[PDB]
């Protein structure tokens, strides 16, 4: 479907995703632990019965009828984790995730309350502006002609330099700011 590094989903990936969704929905229908354990073992036996099938069209039809079976017997509202999308506390703390570039607009009167922190911030910014040209030069010669094929980034090959495009995924805000 929508993948950063791959253009498609393999057959085994589809089977594993179906297995996880079916087990989660069966846990939702079977709220007690022992009952869920019993029916999870039954579902695991059903999945292991057709594990060794070499016919591609037959495995595809088995997957399609399994997806139809899951859609007929899904929970009207399954159990979603609190931080998972669709959860009760999903994206709750996004109002407190202030980006780090707002510290450059602070008044010097309130910058004096944290001298050592702002010194460390200054040396971090010095490191970033020193490494930017090296990392973009590394990225320029590693992309094949015609643009990149996937969205994966390369690491730093030699010693001393940081991986390319590292700033906004290292300085991201914490989960609980």
């Amino acid at each position: 479907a929508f993948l950063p590094s791959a253009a498609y989903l393999t057959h085994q990936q589809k089977v594993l995703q179906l297995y996880k969704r079916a087990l989660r929905h069966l846990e939702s229908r079977c709220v007690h632990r022992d009952k869920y354990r019993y029916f999870a073992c039954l579902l695991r036996a059903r999945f292991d019965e057709h594990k060794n099938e070499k016919d591609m069209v037959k495995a595809t039809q088995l997957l399609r009828e399994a997806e139809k079976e899951f859609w007929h017997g899904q929970h009207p509202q399954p159990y979603i984790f609190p931080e998972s999308p669709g959860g009760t506390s999903y994206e709750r703390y996004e109002c407190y995730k202030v980006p780090e570039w707002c510290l450059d607009d602070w008044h010097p009167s309130e910058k004096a309350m944290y001298p050592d922190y702002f010194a460390k911030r200054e040396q971090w910014k010095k490191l970033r502006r020193e490494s930017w040209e090296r990392e973009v030069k590394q990225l320029q010669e590693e992309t094949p002609v015609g643009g990149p094929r996937t969205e994966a980034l390369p690491p730093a090959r030699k010693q001393g330099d940081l991986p390319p495009l590292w700033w906004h995924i290292v300085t991201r805000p914490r989960e609980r700011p």
Partner: protein
């Protein structure tokens, strides 16, 4: 132990504006309230009375509060 820096936008300028607004409102608000209290206590309001015969009032003698008459 384990105190973390909390990144927040610069709140200095907003507080400065609020302090300036409060100071410049109160700079004339406090003397006006004091003056209104002193007008009300010591000068006081007018008392309704019938017009004497042959006497015509001025146009500002038809109001009660001293400030409205002024």
């Amino acid at each position: 132990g384990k105190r973390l820096f909390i990144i927040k936008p610069s709140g200095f300028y907003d507080k400065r504006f609020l302090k300036l607004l409060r100071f410049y409102i109160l700079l004339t608000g406090i003397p006006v309230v004091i003056g209104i209290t002193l007008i009300n206590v010591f000068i006081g309001e007018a008392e309704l009375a019938e017009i004497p015969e042959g006497y015509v009032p001025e146009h500002w003698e038809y109001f009660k509060h001293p400030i409205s008459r002024w």
